Amino acid sequence: NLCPFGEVFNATRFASVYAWNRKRISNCVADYSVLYNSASFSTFKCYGVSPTKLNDLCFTNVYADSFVIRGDEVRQIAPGQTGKIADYNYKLPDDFTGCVIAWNSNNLDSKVGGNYNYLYRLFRKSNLKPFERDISTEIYQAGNTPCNGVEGFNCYFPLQSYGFQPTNGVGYQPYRVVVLSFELLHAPATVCGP
């Protein structure tokens, strides 16, 4: 009856940023101490809380989002940001109350020769609403001309692969990120710490 973080932060399989991944946690406990005594993360900022004095802070249920993004895009995962990622892959709300945890995983997410399994939505007609998930693969239509499956002028496939390759400068390496989302509506809050 502990909150199953161990299967989110240590999961061998992360999803692409565009198809970011979510796990709702409820009915358990949580040791937010161990997460920031591990001290193995590169970036760990928390907005609208404070990791230490959060073990007494109970919440109805907490969400844990995970994906993978270029090292210099982790600045886009913050409340009030814009860019390729925050605008078309995962947008954080202005009034955000949670934590953003990232840790360079180039020793696993950029195999020899280039890892092309991780993608990032590149073309979109308007921006994401907070915690929105766009999975559409339909051919992006830049012009008046309906594409209907044909790549070509004014016709672009929206999802572009990262060129993950380990020799690249750190900025262009894979950084596994897992955003923690704490919410509390008027209902039995069951995600307490000790």
Epitope: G83, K84, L122, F123, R124, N127, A142, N154, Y156, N168
Partner: antibody, heavy 117, light 109 residues
């Protein structure tokens, strides 16, 4: 009739304002990465600023807070307002649709910005 | 950021020659850069996108290769309408592109 005819820009003192116009036709500027790239006589191609489909913008440190990319999606036109102009800005300005990986395929005709007092 | 760099600052070539221009980027841009042609007074012209996909409306004699960090444009038979400067661009940070110094192909003599 895929073409981008840019206009608005000739000569103006160091500090004055001049708005540029890119009249898209064939594509839509409302759903495209619309960039401006500047180029001097004895220099290469330098990116100046960007406007996404989601309306988000971004400009190079030597511009930030002096120019301001715009667009009117009722006239299918891309704009660029240039305030507190200086001598470093003297160069030809091209508007072009960045097709991401597919590359900058469509390019504006041409517009010169000689700037000096 | 990513640094781009052309090889011969300006090479010399004849009509019917087979020219080869180079371009290498700071990181391992994996197959994500196109090639451009510019004649004085005109706008750039796209030639190759995504390393080696030929642009429609572009002669058959324009090649394209490179995939990792060191790329290369190669024209089969230089025709007179091909004397111009050719630049390369990186579409890795796609919204925020950069170019190379360009390589000016003139007439050998």
């Amino acid at each position: 009739e895929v073409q981008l005819v840019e206009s608005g820009g000739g000569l103006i003192q160091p500090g004055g304002s001049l708005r540029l116009s890119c009249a898209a036709s064939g594509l839509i500027v409302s759903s495209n990465y619309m960039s401006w790239v500047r180029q001097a006589p004895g220099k290469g191609l330098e990116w100046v600023s960007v406007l996404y489909a989601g309306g988000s913008t971004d400009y190079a440190g030597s511009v930030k807070g002096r120019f301001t990319i715009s667009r009117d999606n009722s006239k299918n036109t891309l704009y660029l307002q240039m305030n507190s102009l200086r001598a470093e800005d003297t160069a030809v300005y091209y508007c072009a649709r960045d097709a991401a990986v597919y590359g900058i395929d469509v390019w504006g005709q041409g517009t010169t910005v000689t700037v000096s007092s | 950021d990513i640094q781009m760099t052309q090889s011969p600052s300006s090479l010399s070539a004849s009509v019917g020659d087979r020219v080869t221009i180079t371009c290498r980027a700071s990181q391992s841009i994996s197959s994500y850069l196109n090639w451009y042609q510019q004649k004085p007074g005109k706008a750039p012209k796209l030639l190759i996108y995504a390393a080696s996909s030929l642009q429609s409306g572009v002669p058959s004699r324009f090649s394209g290769s490179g995939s990792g960090t060191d790329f290369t444009l190669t024209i089969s038979s230089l025709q007179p309408e091909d004397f111009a400067t050719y630049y390369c661009q990186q579409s890795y940070t796609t919204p925020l592109f950069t170019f190379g110094p360009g390589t000016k192909v003139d007439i050998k003599r």
